[PDB]
Amino acid sequence: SALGKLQDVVNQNAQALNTLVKQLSSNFGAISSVLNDILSRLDPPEAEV
Amino acid sequence: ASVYAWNRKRISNCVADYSVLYNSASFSTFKCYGVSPTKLNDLCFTNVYA
């Protein structure tokens, strides 16, 4: 634990990036979290929503 | 069958042409919810039930 101060900064940056990439897997109330699935499955009037 | 004993048929291991369902005018209501009607020929499915 000698170099903990640098390791905390590295871990916080990597964890923030990891959470940012994890946010892509959430649909946020939509039918799916994948854009390609929505583009392939729906007409534009529902796809815009 | 009647609506209390509605008949459920599994559809699997087939290639399905849904374009004869869209282009047929015999259906009074042809309404899809989770999928576009014109994209049915472009997608692959499982757990198909009629």
Side-chain angles (χ1 to χ4, degrees):
Chain A
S1 59
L3 285 177
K5 296 186 67 40
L6 312 177
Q7 195 64 63
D8 291 349
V9 177
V10 171
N11 287 357
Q12 281 184 291
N13 284 309
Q15 178 192 53
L17 279 178
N18 190 359
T19 305
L20 180 71
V21 190
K22 289 290 181 67
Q23 283 297 100
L24 287 176
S25 71
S26 288
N27 47 41
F28 306 104
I31 63 170
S32 186
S33 60
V34 182
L35 292 175
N36 266 324
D37 276 13
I38 293 165
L39 267 299
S40 61
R41 278 165 58 175
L42 289 181
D43 40 8
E46 278 73 46
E48 288 204 350
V49 178
Chain B
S2 50
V3 71
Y4 89 100
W6 51 271
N7 184 57
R8 186 165 191 109
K9 189 170 178 66
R10 183 176 176 87
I11 296 90
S12 62
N13 191 359
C14 75
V15 57
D17 193 6
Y18 307 87
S19 193
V20 303
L21 282 72
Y22 195 67
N23 299 323
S24 183
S26 300
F27 305 123
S28 312
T29 301
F30 183 78
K31 187 200 306 184
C32 303
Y33 272 77
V35 65
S36 171
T38 187
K39 303 288 183 171
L40 294 174
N41 278 41
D42 302 336
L43 310 185
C44 279
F45 303 106
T46 191
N47 275 107
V48 183
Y49 297 101

